Design a protein that fits this description.
3 copies of one chain form a homotrimer. By secondary structure, chain A is an alpha/beta fold. Helices cover 29% and strands 16% of the residues of chain A. The radius of gyration of chain A is 21 Å and the shape is globular. Chains in contact: A-B, A-C, B-C. The complex binds calcium ion (CA) (3 copies). The PDB classes it as oxidoreductase.
């Protein structure tokens, strides 16, 4: 009776780069099949506008700020990671009988205690850092050359992939390999006779922009070189989703599986993505940076052919997956999301009269976002707080703060209140970022929460 | 095992009760408890303002040791006095006591920081730093703001609660809290365990709002604010009388230890008087953290006496624990002492031991050390001063120049004591925390410099 | 079957100040006996180039940076110490049946929970601070005079020694007393019928430079006054080692005991030491500061008359002692060392293709060191990173970074990677050091890891 759960996460997939969310040029039929026979979300938000903190939030069900994970891990490697006392959704499900697998991108710590096998994943196949070169014919020779030279700090994008701690020699284009291993996983799950949970973390369409010629050949009308490469990268994900769906059907798993497909953040416009109609992209507190595509699919439980128009947070997946699995959640875990299912079924706002936050730090100041009901408050580029009616003004073109003073001020002060239990960052993505953090007396919330 | 009542007035000045020298405000019911018990001429709180003082009372620890050196953010927060420091209420509750808290909290409004999770079976009051006194005034303002859609409403006008459910209060807040203190000790009769009551009045803290009937009792007080203040204190005294008539009615009075005190010194610009002490609220001068206190407990606490040796608010935790038969573990790191053995023998419970105060400011800190007859003072970025506080209670005569070695030794022991102070877990305003970080605080290089 | 273990640690013993490690002037025959019938180490490194952090590392098996112990404890006293959640090697061995003793210098916290008896030492005899005056005839009168004056913050070098928390009145030159108590310990261990572990932490030859006339009389050819005093101090250690060895033989303990003799850091050149052929000394990331003498001795298990030429870290003693004792180590402990025994027996590098680090903080910047295989990277005096082939260039005279850019950069980046789990310091050795730490936004790893 308890359903299987598949969380598919594309990396830097732009808002307009799947068909079901308005793509005019990239075609994603297998992903679209899941949308057409399920529900898509027009107001889905991640907890942070870039990779590491967004992913920390997905797994922990907590705003990354609450657990010191506001920054990506140090790009050249580290002995730190998402804190081990915050129980991952995989570990919870595993403790309630689920068979658990994770594939592809991790970027939440490479130490023994931060490794997927210790965060409640029985199976893991992928690469532990922030991304990876896509062609083994290219990356394996570079790693061979650097290792034989004696070097220990080798760029994590060319290191060998692993399976449960043992290295492997990958042969296929990485997107295809991860898809293949997703098939292998759900095939292994047939014999287990428990429900299963799969975290499928594709690196596509994250840099570097490397695509197969066979995928790029499907977009002859895309004249721009990078956009074409990107299109091929996304299509490879779509082929993967089709390959996984044929395997689920083969095993009679398809009907009792909740599939969630989403992005971890907004697309990067300078690396082939499109976020139409949203402003800006990756790393912004504008909508482009943390409003993402999402679909649910689960026959007879998730309504087919619908589009859910109320705010949903990536933080909601933790308690929602838990509720659907029959897993008790303790109050000592401090989950920032909500079980969105009661409100989803009744077609009501699961965050009625409640804020959804984004807060991205920069050098000496912070950009911020608040989404509640129809309203979107925006703090960006050291400007005064702006307010938009995001239902009417999705592109954030018309600041109506001047005629809503009390409402905006109230929203900012509630964020100010919310800020106090944010931990100091446990790391930064670069050594100079942490020096500057300390030099600038951060967080400079005097700037961030100043009002009229 | 005795019942225990800790009554705490908020910003009650040193000279604003009769038993501690008031010439103008009259407090007969409070004075009754003094007359038939023991008052304390050298009683000190752990910090010269509300939040950290109260954190210390409940935890038995200097607030600096647990990151609670500042009042909680004035516009609300998700933080509070850390949950791993067990409150005296929780300890007593685990040793069979029925536990109640009334009025002011100001130690965290989250589920895990709420009174019901800090070991209080009953709670009636308001969770923030204070409250407007008249429901006729505050409830319409809250109705208007709530219907407007606003979520960050000023905590002084929000509705009071009883164990997490809201209520619609009808009386002047001081009288309501007194009434609920009666209701509590009445509920305690049927329980047949001993009880503990934390009665945290907001009077005479701002705003200065008094009943006309109380102000009418001070026709000779010409100053408007002092009159209002006087009426506010008198309302507390009426409350204490109403509680005492209830204790007698239930035959609880004879087996109850009542402690009446202030959380800190009075604020001179808001109607208080701290005579004969210098300065007031927030100072490391005596005015800021030397407070009135009485114990009352028939046959156990001597009647009509005045105890002249130093006592700390930190002492109430282990002293209440000892009197209740509650074991205290060393892993708790209590900074106070069980003052009862020394109290009975009329000896100094802190003989040859310092009592500290340390209040932070913008880019520097003021400090105080009280040991035996001596009072060391660091204030206003001046050199350390020393006073013989037995002879010189008003701190008029700095005798540091002729006691160099002693002063230096005292400061160095404070310097030693400072190292396990945690970084603050919050500040009362966002700018205070920014400045803390900008100024590289604590600037203990200034605070512990000697010559 | 399970061996006894003795860790003898001299304090600030210079690289060239024992015979077995090249001394031409100081003579140390009993120490040399252990070298001659065992193995010495030419490439032995401690975890930090000064006392407190080095010792924290020895006991915890962790780089002191990982546990907030990068600085010596506050010189005038404190309520902090090496964190209690990092299990000491003594506690581990004690939990696996060993009888445990510690002698002399502690300098890892003087509070109840940081005291030797709570860090897994059944027996303790010594002084809790960073050093001590050597002659009871001199120091006890000064302490008597200051205590009777009323002072509480008395210089830790003159305070009385203790035995398991009770004070004593020591009569002998401190080095001789500690040696005597080491005898007393191994005599007490005979009756126990378990294996034993002894941490013998001499303060010699740390300042102050105080020696017996009888020891100084053995070096008539040393014309320099301080070097002679120093020589006598080291000789007193050597007499102690002989006195301990005669006791081990008397009890038939000698043959089944692993004796490790080492220094906690490099010698201080301005206080009588010699670090030949190494550059600089105490507190430097040059070799002089953290490359130290070490010998192992254990008959039939440790090869006799050999000299091990591969890198060994003080961090290795924790897991190596554990493995030899049959004590399981959990991964949750985060040991930074390795069990060096498999590689030691095969005469292979126990840290093949693995770095050994040093990182000493200063005012506004940090000096650093990396030792891997033949290479030594050096960050000193705010200069660019240097690289030496330490096999060819032990004195660090010839920077070959200009022709090995990729290798140096790779080494620094691996240190940069390693730095991220370093905790903020939990204390500093002086109040102004911590203020400056905060003012200068430390750690300034932007300077420390620039390439
Ligand atoms: Ca991403
Ligand atoms: Ca107060
Ligand atoms: Ca030393």
């Amino acid at each position: 009776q308890k359903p299987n759960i598949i969380l598919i996460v594309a990396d830097d997939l732009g808002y307009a780069d799947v068909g079901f969310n308005g793509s005019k040029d990239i075609i994603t039929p297998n992903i679209d099949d899941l949308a057409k026979s399920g529900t898509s979300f027009s107001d889905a938000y991640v907890a942070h506008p870039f990779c590491g903190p967004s992913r920390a939030a997905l797994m922990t069900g907590r705003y990354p700020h609450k657990i010191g994970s506001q920054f990506n891990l140090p790009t050249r490697g580290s002995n730190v990671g998402v804190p081990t006392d915050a129980k991952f959704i995989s570990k919870l499900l595993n403790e309630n009988n689920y068979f658990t697998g994770a594939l592809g991108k991790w970027h939440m710590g490479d130490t023994p205690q931060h490794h997927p096998n210790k965060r409640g994943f029985d199976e893991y196949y992928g690469f532990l850092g922030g991304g990876h070169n896509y062609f083994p014919d290219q990356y394996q020779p570079q790693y061979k050359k650097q290792k034989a030279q004696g070097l220990k700090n080798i760029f994590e994008y060319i290191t060998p992939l692993e399976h449960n701690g043992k290295e492997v020699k990958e042969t296929q284009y990485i997107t295809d390999a991860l898809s293949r291993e997703a098939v292998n996983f759900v095939d292994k799950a047939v014999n287990k006779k428990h429900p299963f949970f799969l975290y499928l973390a594709y690196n596509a369409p994250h840099t570097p922009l490397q695509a197969k010629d066979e995928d790029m050949a499907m977009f002859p009308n895309i004249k721009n070189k990078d956009r074409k490469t990107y299109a091929g990268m996304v299509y490879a994900v779509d082929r993967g989703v089709g390959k996984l769906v044929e395997a689920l059907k083969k095993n009679n798993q398809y009907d009792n599986t909740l599939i969630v497909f989403m992005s971890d953040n907004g697309g990067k416009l300078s690396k082939g993505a499109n976020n139409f109609p949203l402003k800006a992209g990756k790393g912004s507190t504008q909508e482009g940076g943390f409003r993402v595509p999402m679909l649910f699919h689960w026959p007879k439980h998730v309504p087919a052919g619908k589009r859910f128009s109320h705010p949903v947070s990536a933080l909601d997946l933790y308690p929602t997956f838990a509720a659907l699995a029959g897993a008790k959640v303790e109050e000592n875990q401090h989950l920032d999301g909500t079980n969105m299912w009661p409100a989803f079924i009744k077609n009501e706002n699961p965050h009625k009269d409640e804020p959804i936050y984004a807060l991205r730090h920069r050098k000496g100041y912070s950009d911020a976002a608040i989404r509640m009901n129809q309203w979107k408050a925006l703090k960006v580029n050291q400007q005064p707080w702006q307010l938009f009616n995001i239902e009417n003004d999705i592109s954030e073109k018309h600041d109506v703060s001047k005629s809503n003073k009390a409402l905006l001020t109230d929203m900012v002060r509630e964020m100010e209140k919310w800020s106090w239990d944010n931990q100091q960052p446990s790391w930064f993505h670069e050594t100079t970022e942490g020096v500057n953090w300390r030099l600038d007396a951060m967080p400079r919330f005097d700037k961030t929460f100043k009002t009229t």
